Amino acid sequence: KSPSAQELKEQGNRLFVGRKYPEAAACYGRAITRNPLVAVYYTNRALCYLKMQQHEQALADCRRALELDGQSVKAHFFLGQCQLEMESYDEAIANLQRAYSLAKEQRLNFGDDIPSALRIAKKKRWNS
């Protein structure tokens, strides 16, 4: 009769991969209604807002996620990406470096994604 938070997150994940970003973000919003203390729902929605060029909305969701999970690699990484697109280069680099440190501490492996993002951000700061 009613979807669980997990059903809604799964539906949002499918819409995200399907390039339906506003629809995915709304699904994560419905998951948040059901369980508002889960940081992943906010970081997932932040990534949707990034793909929608809605940087202020993405930044707010990263901040919410960080209140719920201060160790979140993705909250720091997406926050850094947000700030990079808003030309806040020093803050972007700090958050990407923090994502690097947290990923190493948590033994996560994203390939060279985080160092590559750092190089991109430093080059953009210099080129601007």
Partner: peptide, 6 residues
């Protein structure tokens, strides 16, 4: 990739 939902 890190550029993905969880």
């Amino acid at each position: 990739s890190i550029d993905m939902v969880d």
